[PDB]
């Protein structure tokens, strides 16, 4: 987790993998899944 290099389309495509990864909520900056960690 912590920005994972999976190159995004928009915000809830990014939530679905890095929710399953272990992160809290998922949000897509510079083409790039970042997420919320504990």
Same mark, same amino acid.
């Given at each position: @987790?912590?920005?994972?290099?999976? /190159? *995004? $389309?928009? $915000?809830?495509?990014?939530? /679905? !993998?890095? /929710? ?5 909520? @998922?949000? *897509?900056?510079?083409?790039? *899944?970042?997420?919320? !960690?504990?």
């Amino acid at each position: @987790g912590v920005e994972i290099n999976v /190159k *995004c $389309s928009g $915000s809830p495509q990014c939530l /679905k !993998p890095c /929710k399953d990864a272990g992160m809290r909520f @998922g949000k *897509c900056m510079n083409r790039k *899944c970042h997420c919320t !960690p504990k």
